């Protein structure tokens, strides 16, 4: 076992040595009125980690669109960090535009409780997605061996936000959830009055009176959010 | 801040009480040499969870074919649980197979850290992915208001699987990956001489000695893995 | 092995959820000048805590006769409490009135020291009564296969505040005591001056100076107590099952 | 605020000084097979402390029906124990037959978490009904001026046996439950499983898959449990005044 | 072994409830410039300490003469302490006129160390002789089957007083010391010079500098000290059974 | 606050000093099957002590009657010690035959609890009464300035024997008691049946059933205790000064 | 081993009880200006500690015209002080003129870590020089059998107070040294530079830089702490 | 302040490295049957340390007859201890015959308490006599600007184990004490018997029971004894400057 954040703490304060230069987190995002997703990586020069690199890169002006900035995390030193940048632009021909955190001894890693038991020296996979009050929304932890879904991780933010807007709860697999589709779901009340004054006026389908829903998101936040999850699934038709 | 399990760590052995009797985990399935997923999610009778346990069943099949088994977890008691499965079958028309732990008090939630600061009391929407040696290879927290996407957990089973068997190390967004397609990678050189004698030969597609693979996955493998990411995709015909 | 409050003690303060909103304790009953009846439950969607459930509500209307109020406390989430109630309601005809405390962790039953180990994992049926200016008057302590008999609580604080506004102390089975039946105690002497003066005009019946009473209390006092207690024995002349 | 014996639990191990004599228990009775209850009261020559004795003593007979022995507990030594006793039979012509502990250092009070807060040194009104594996199985705190309901305390061993030998759980108010009566209830199904095989049934009235009933009480255990309660309810037509 | 208050040390403040009222000791005698002897029994109802708080109550006004109260303590409650006074005066045909302190939790016992080994439970029977300024000048403990002889207290106050007026040591055995008789004792020189300047004149014999002494105490000191000590050997000539 | 040896309690195991050498208590007592009187003393050399010494040893042949030894302590030295019973021999003509303990550190007086409050250094004035099993039986605490009763002592010493040997408990002011005599009190009963059992028969006078005495001792023992008391009594007809 | 004052430290502060009253210490010797030597024995009526009192009461005019005070300190009480020193003025004709502390309980002994390892009762043969500004200057600890050379504590002090006055050190066996005589020294230099200023005469014999003196003594305080010697070594024509 | 070794205590055990080489302490004197004498010094090359070991090295002899050693103690190096040594030698014309400690980090001072608050750094002028079982006999601490009396640590040593032979005490100032000259006292007596049979017949002079004394000491050995005195008293006729 070890310690670690929590969803719904705010992101530690801590100053960051980066391949951009120091930044202080959360606040360099904060401060910009931008959400932050922060993912880390066991090492520079792997091949997993280069391919996450990539596909991130490639996904970095959706992120931007939805005012969301990407940084990485290595144990890695910034001469490699920037090394490893370079390989990748001269071998695959995609510069990475983020800033990557250069963890020489892993006490960012450490902070963050992203040491795990995978292996002594080389942090985990870990993800958070940070909003604009410096708050941790979500955590994603995927084995040293499995890259991650890069789409998924824009679904994620782009549904929180439209909860966060629209104050409502997104289901299951949205926007294709099998039972209300793109619907987003009205929070539940938390008191009988609320319950009965829920249960009646007709303010919504409801299965029940702590299921009720509607189809508030506009037409192009749905479309936006399935086109991320039609590309995880399209086969590339093109490669290197 | 707070103590969780770590990936790479043996799932914490413990006797649970579920919907459908106690059970020891991690040994009830790794005695069958099964994987299981336990997800957890902070209430019954509650809409986003209750569209997530309809997601799941509708998958269960996908599960039971990878041999992997399901398993919820609440703060709830067991009639709680059988008031909202019995609630489920008869307004959904859909019966919810695998069992709820019922965790009345949080001690199975405070001894796996599944308490985070949403929320003092009622649980995170954590994901445990632990496979046939009782050991946890992957760990995902999405926020209580964010609905899982039910197919990004069984790619993650399905791709672990092949890289266990095939011995492998699986590119981001597999089987569509942008650098690679569906081609997974040879765990890297870690000495100067294992690194000569790969940069040394006819074997694998090769960016640098570091960066090789080739594309061990069968055609059904992949096809499988591919129609998990189409179903994400695709826009729900019929809406229960 | 456990810890509780005690008799005499204040009720802790806390802020507690409930089916109804927020609430904190004892104030919201102390400003009020009512007394308040805490009852828990191991859970919800269970026979026994059900039976309980129906019986303090067809008796509500008696509490609040005395100034009194109810409210119950479960492990289980509001929204349990929300389709248990809305059970009850639809499936036997009763609404329950009052509120009851949703606490999922166990923040408020181990606060109370109402976490026995008749089960890790849910509330034994601990029952607190407290006075308007916030003190535990009495707790019982049920099992968990053992329904309560409501009246009894009804007769408890009946008898304390009838004790509290007259100044005496109530005989056991009062109204009905086999020695001295409706008569209240007078505070026994603590000092041999006091007890000199006791005895000392027949002021009232006494067995020994630090055994004396008296009949103080109203024929309407006397009755209503024992209706509750007649109420208790007579068998159900229908059965809602039915 | 304090720590006490909870429910569940087998009741604490200790030797206690007795005006019978020495006593192990929760042993002495569980070797026998008998229930106990425990009853303590604040002090000796007390008013309220009375009338519970008398009313105890009046319904030893019922208790000793029910296999359950009775047992004192006050802060007072033996030697008042004895004299107080004395003076019950013969200013009110009953002889007090059950035990009475002596704890002149609340030591056993202590250990049983018996003194509140109510006040400093005499034991609180406190009542345990142990069961004859020693398990602890209801505890009631009534206030220093409130005489207990000893009928209630009946009511409460005869619904623990039988829901024990029954193996039935008891609803509110039973024998008289307004919703079934002198019904028992069968313990709710714990898996999805059980709730489905559980239907109908011939005798098992259901309200819901968790909530079923029979009526397996004998009519003597049923009129039994119902004479305490209308004991309780009648005016006695003789006070011992 | 056990904390005990000292010889020499301010009797502990603290507030007590005795059959005559709440009390706070020693502020309740020294307000009165009172002097106290407060004794302990291990429980009421028993016998060898009826038979003192008789010979206690009987010397009542040989205590009052000097100035000093009596004050007991026991482990049982006010109502045993009342109903055992009533006893003694009803078949013994005496009345206690002093308060007795009830400690049902030893928490006073406990507090004054007095509760010892001789029995768990049951303080021991300790006696305290406090003097106005409440200052413990003496204590006593005797085992639990064995009566004060109250005369040889009275004897202790009266000597304290006496020593203390007139700046003396009082001689073993006194008024019928051995090698001074009446005498009272001078306190020794405690430096050269004094003991240099110590010589025997007019009133003061001397078997060497240390040992000096005069007969300063009034006739009536002598023989009310020496009555105490023909009493107690005295044969009764009566017997109150 | 300080820390005493209970009544009760086994005299603490230690290896003490004395003028006649080195000697372990209590065993050195207890296997002899002797009762021993350990008085300690302030300071050699000082008048109270003295006069006490000089009453002990001609109450010696009394102790050894009742087969009892006595040693004193004191903070001083061996060598005073020595020097002050060369003194009183000479000065006063009575050789003192009991040790006394050499205590220069307070070693002994810290074990005993006898450092109190009433002067730092130099002990107070304690007496323990101890019997041949090693038992503490009584402790009384003189104060500084008052010489001790020492026919006292030997009455309680006497009272204890005669207590322990046939099994009684003995009234206040014995022989000479104002209810029962020279009556001993048999010990109450501690449950029901023992005091219903009780019975006033031709040997056991009773005023209650907690109160029963007889009268076992013998015409000696009565008459050795009565003599200590008179001795007490009386004015000496020679004083030794 | 035990606690102890040290040389150079300051006389502990303390009121102490002795046979001419209460004294406190240094205080009492400071305030007059005078130094004082403390002496502790064993025990009162020894004959060892005896013979030293009356060693020390013959050398009182030597003392005090050094103007130093003598204290003695014994575990006995101020009764068996004063029938001692009675008995010695009786038995061998002569006055004990100082006071003796009186310590009934090792408290002066123990604060003075007196009480050695020879009887955990009874101190030991102490002695402490201190000067008049309270600084102990001087530790004899002779055993319980062995009585001690008074003339030598003269010595001491005499010594002390010439080299205190005149700045210098003392030779062995001064004023008999047998390499300077009667000469005191001159502090050694601590540095390089004093070293080299320091020469032939230009003031001192010297035997190195390190090793100068000269005879700054007075005629009569040389005498004077021979004749303390003299003394020592001469056999009395008397014995009382 | 701080800790040291205690008179009565055994020298610690050490190895310790010196001059001569590595030597453990007590052992290699004590397995020799040898008595040392350990001195201690701030440091090398410093004139008071200087004129003390030429004092010791010329009393070397007188050391040896009495089968006893030196063995110096110093904060330098090995290498300053034999520089010096050699300086000394060439110098003065006087070689130091026996081994100096060489303790570079106050162990061995700060093991024997030698770090005194005259100067941190820097041991103190300890000296500490040991016998040949390893037991400390004296212990000296001279100031640092003082040097010590050789002469008075031989008549130490003399006396020492003149009185462990004989079995006496050594009175002030022997051989030349004021009220018996060169006698020896007898140690006193510890209890009263002792003293009792004590008596001055012939041999045994008295001045009291606890002052007994004979002359059994040879001339020789109290001459040696004078004769150090005397050295110590005679102004040199040479001076070696």
Same mark, same amino acid.
């Given at each position: 076992?070890?310690?670690?954040?929590?969803?719904?703490?705010?992101?530690?304060?801590?100053?960051?040595?980066?391949?951009?230069?120091?930044?202080?987190?959360?606040?360099?995002?904060?401060?910009?009125?931008?959400?932050?997703?922060?993912?880390?990586?066991?090492?520079?020069?792997?091949?997993?980690?280069?391919?996450?690199?990539?596909?991130?890169?490639?996904?970095?002006?959706?992120?931007?669109?939805?005012?969301?900035?990407?940084?990485?995390?290595?144990?890695?030193?910034?001469?490699?960090?920037?090394?490893?940048?370079?390989?990748?632009?001269?071998?695959?021909?995609?510069?990475?535009?983020? %800033?990557?955190?250069?963890?020489?001894?892993?006490?960012?890693? /450490?902070?963050? @409780?992203?040491?795990?038991?995978?292996?002594?020296?080389?942090?985990? /996979?870990?993800?958070?997605?940070?909003?604009?009050?410096?708050?941790? $929304?979500?955590?994603?932890?995927?084995?040293?061996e499995l890259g991650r879904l890069v789409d998924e991780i824009l679904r994620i933010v782009k549904?929180?936000?439209l909860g966060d807007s629209l104050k409502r709860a997104v289901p299951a697999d949205w926007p294709?959830?099998?039972?209300?589709?793109? @619907?987003?779901?009205?929070? %539940?009340?938390?008191?009988?009055?609320?319950?009965?004054?829920?249960?009646?006026?007709?303010?919504?389908?409801?299965?029940?009176?702590?299921?009720?829903?509607?189809?508030?998101?506009?037409?192009?936040?749905?479309?936006?959010?399935?086109?991320?999850?039609? $590309?995880?699934?399209?086969?590339?038709?093109?490669?290197?």
């Amino acid at each position: 076992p070890g310690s670690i954040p929590l969803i719904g703490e705010r992101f530690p304060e801590m100053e960051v040595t980066t391949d951009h230069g120091v930044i202080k987190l959360p606040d360099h995002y904060v401060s910009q009125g931008k959400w932050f997703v922060l993912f880390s990586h066991p090492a520079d020069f792997t091949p997993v980690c280069t391919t996450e690199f990539v596909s991130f890169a490639r996904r970095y002006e959706d992120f931007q669109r939805l005012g969301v900035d990407l940084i990485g995390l290595s144990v890695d030193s910034v001469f490699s960090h920037i090394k490893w940048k370079e390989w990748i632009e001269r071998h695959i021909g995609v510069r990475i535009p983020f %800033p990557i955190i250069a963890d020489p001894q892993g006490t960012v890693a /450490r902070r963050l @409780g992203l040491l795990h038991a995978e292996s002594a020296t080389h942090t985990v /996979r870990g993800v958070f997605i940070v909003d604009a009050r410096g708050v941790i $929304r979500t955590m994603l932890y995927y084995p040293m061996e499995l890259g991650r879904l890069v789409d998924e991780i824009l679904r994620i933010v782009k549904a929180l936000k439209l909860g966060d807007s629209l104050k409502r709860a997104v289901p299951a697999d949205w926007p294709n959830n099998e039972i209300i589709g793109e @619907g987003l779901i009205v929070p %539940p009340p938390t008191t009988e009055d609320q319950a009965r004054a829920r249960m009646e006026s007709g303010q919504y389908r409801c299965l029940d009176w702590w299921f009720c829903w509607d189809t508030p998101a506009s037409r192009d936040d749905v479309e936006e959010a399935r086109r991320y999850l039609r $590309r995880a699934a399209e086969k590339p038709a093109k490669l290197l």
